[PDB]
Amino acid sequence: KAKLSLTQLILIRLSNRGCQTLEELEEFTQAKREVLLVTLTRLHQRGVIYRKWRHFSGRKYREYCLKHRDELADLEH
Numbered sequence: 001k002a003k004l005s006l007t008q009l010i011l012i013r014l015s016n017r018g019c020q021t022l023e024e025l026e027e028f029t030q031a032k033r034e035v036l037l038v039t040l041t042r043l044h045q046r047g048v049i050y051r052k053w054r055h056f057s058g059r060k061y062r063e064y065c066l067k068h069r070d071e072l073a074d075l076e077h
Contacts, residue, residue, distance in 0.1 A: 006031055006039050014066035021063050052077050
């Protein structure tokens, strides 16, 4: 993991699985949430990684999908 950047780690992780959570990316990278969010946000502005809230077990959690139309995210969720 250390050999790759946090950008590479997230993108490759989301390449393996279309959508992951911040907590799952946290465990994957072992990086800080804020630091990962910086990468996710900068990629989000580039239209690379998209975000959507999903209600689960009485609580809403935000998850991130790679190369997934935001419109489609709204339709699916």
